[PDB]
């Protein structure tokens, strides 16, 4: 919340659009270039997105951005054009079309790896709208976008949803959650980042032991290497030399893990009876990623149960860092770290804003120089005619 309001967004974006173009003229020039099958400058598009007055013209913006990303120059979309489109959505609805072009991703090719994600997220927080902010969290994680502490802003959000979770999670949901715990948590500053790492590693560990290792890394920015529970227990081993864990939810979730891993073993018909889909097709199409020497994780269960029982006896007795709530404590943390990080972003984002204008200026200059050269050579060939 503090980010958006204290950043002075609207003033800068109002200050940005200098171009003075027309929508129908750009649409006809574009449609022409796609008809004759030729490329299109990123300039024409940035203009077309700058000049939108309406929801209908935002529809038209969507269409021409699509039909642009399917054109030879699709790698030439700059940051300021993406920015224009996001801000235009902020002018109108902001909560539908930006999310739709982010979830579409590949087709429209917005890919705003930037403070823009932070911006969108804040404009969700102000207005509530939880679920859509959640999906946007997932897409910011899929693009692995965090060099910015949108992480905390997102970690915050995810952990909100982490309390908002009481439900039986399916395969893909468990995966999504594990990934949104892991990739967003990079945080060395606090215990909460570390215990959310534990949460994630645990969830993904469940995913692995229950279905398959392939289920985990399939489309996700995760690693195919089988050890995951071991990575979590490694983060719990880091506590011998280090102060903090947050460590209530580490307890609760790793308890659910230990409980499903336990329960699956004595009861075969209770736990494992749930997959009936195709036995012959799955036995014939059966593939094994894991080696024979690799020591399948399912055979290491007596050690895991020990470590979580050994380590949890150490941590609470040593670190004494048991949190009374993860949700609230994390909320306080990132709300505390928020303002200074804002104050650091304001300095940079501004210099970017001037840079983008410098680039647009240079490019329009090149457009003009080219057109004038073409007109001079055209007059030179039209006034005095020599051709073979």
């Amino acid at each position: 919340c503090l980010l958006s309001a204290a950043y002075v967004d609207s003033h800068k974006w109002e200050a940005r659009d200098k171009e003075d173009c027309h929508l129908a003229d750009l649409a006809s020039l574009m449609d022409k270039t796609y008809e004759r099958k030729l490329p299109v400058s990123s300039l024409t598009i940035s203009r077309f997105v700058d000049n939108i007055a309406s929801r209908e013209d935002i529809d038209h913006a969507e269409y021409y951005l699509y039909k642009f990303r399917h054109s030879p120059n699709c790698w030439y979309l700059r940051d300021w054009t993406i920015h224009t489109w996001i801000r235009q959505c902020l002018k109108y609805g902001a909560q539908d079309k930006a999310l739709y072009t982010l979830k579409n991703k590949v087709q429209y090719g917005i890919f705003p790896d930037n403070y823009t994600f932070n911006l969108l997220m804040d404009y969700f927080i102000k207005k509530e709208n939880y679920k859509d902010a959640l999906s946007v969290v997932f897409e910011i994680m899929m693009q692995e976008a965090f060099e910015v502490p949108s992480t905390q802003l997102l970690s915050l959000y995810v952990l909100y949803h982490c309390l908002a979770e009481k439900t039986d999670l399916s395969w893909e949901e468990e995966r999504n959650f594990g990934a949104s715990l892991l990739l967003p948590g990079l945080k060395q500053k606090n215990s909460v980042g570390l215990s959310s790492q534990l949460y994630g590693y645990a969830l993904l560990g469940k995913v692995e032991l229950q279905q398959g290792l392939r289920a985990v890394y399939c489309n996700m920015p995760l690693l195919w290497q089988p050890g995951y529970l071991h990575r979590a227990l490694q983060v719990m081993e880091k506590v011998a030399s280090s102060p903090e864990d947050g460590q209530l939810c580490g307890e609760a979730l790793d308890v659910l893990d230990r409980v499903l891993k336990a329960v699956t073993a004595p009861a075969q018909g209770t736990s494992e009876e749930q997959p009936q889909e195709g036995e012959e097709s799955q036995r014939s199409e059966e593939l094994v990623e894991q080696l024979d020497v690799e020591e399948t994780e399912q055979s290491k269960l007596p050690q895991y149960l020990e470590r979580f029982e050994a380590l949890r006896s150490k941590l609470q007795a040593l670190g004494k860092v048991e949190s009374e709530s993860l949700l609230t404590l994390s909320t306080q943390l990132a709300k505390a770290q928020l303002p200074t990080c804002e104050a650091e972003d304001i300095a940079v984002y501004e210099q970017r804003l001037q840079q983008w204008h410098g680039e647009r200026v240079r490019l329009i200059q090149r457009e003009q120089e080219q057109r004038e050269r073409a007109r001079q050579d055209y007059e030179a060939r039209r006034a005095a005619k020599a051709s073979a």
Binding site: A24, H60, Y63, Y64, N104, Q107
Partner: peptide
């Protein structure tokens, strides 16, 4: 499955009469 956006009508009849 994805359905591409329908063809736009961008005409402003106030600018060109």
């Amino acid at each position: 499955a994805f359905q591409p956006p329908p063809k736009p009508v961008i005409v402003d009849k106030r600018r060109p009469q």
